[PDB]
Design a protein around this ligand. Structure first.
Ligand SMILES: [Ca+2]
Ligand SMILES: [Ca+2]
Length: 102
């Protein structure tokens, strides 16, 4: 339940993040993998290097399967709002360029 874990976000914000997550999960498997993340960053207008994509995932990949669950996607926005993302890092750019202002 993301609504009890991520209290810093409104329901509308979480739903918007859910909508974006689902947009880029091309295979409907419930995850964003590296290839899917590559495509998302391309379509946001800020393509990332292969290693940069890997490092983006690694920062929030709590179950070490090299792909992002919806919970881990939310962790990106939590980190952005906790002041923990490095200036102009891939994750910072993702959070900025999404329509979601946390
Ligand atoms: Ca997927
Ligand atoms: Ca994972």
């Amino acid at each position: 339940n993301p609504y009890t874990e991520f209290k810093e976000f409104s329901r509308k914000q979480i739903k918007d993040m859910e909508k974006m997550f689902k947009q880029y999960d091309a295979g409907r498997d419930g995850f964003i993998d590296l290839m899917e993340l590559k495509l998302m960053m391309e379509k946001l207008g800020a393509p990332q290097t292969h290693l940069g994509l890997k490092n983006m995932i690694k920062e929030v990949d709590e179950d070490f399967d090299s792909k992002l669950s919806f919970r881990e996607f939310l962790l990106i926005f939590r980190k952005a709002a906790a002041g923990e993302l490095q200036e102009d890092s891939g994750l910072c750019v993702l959070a900025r360029l999404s329509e979601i202002d946390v």
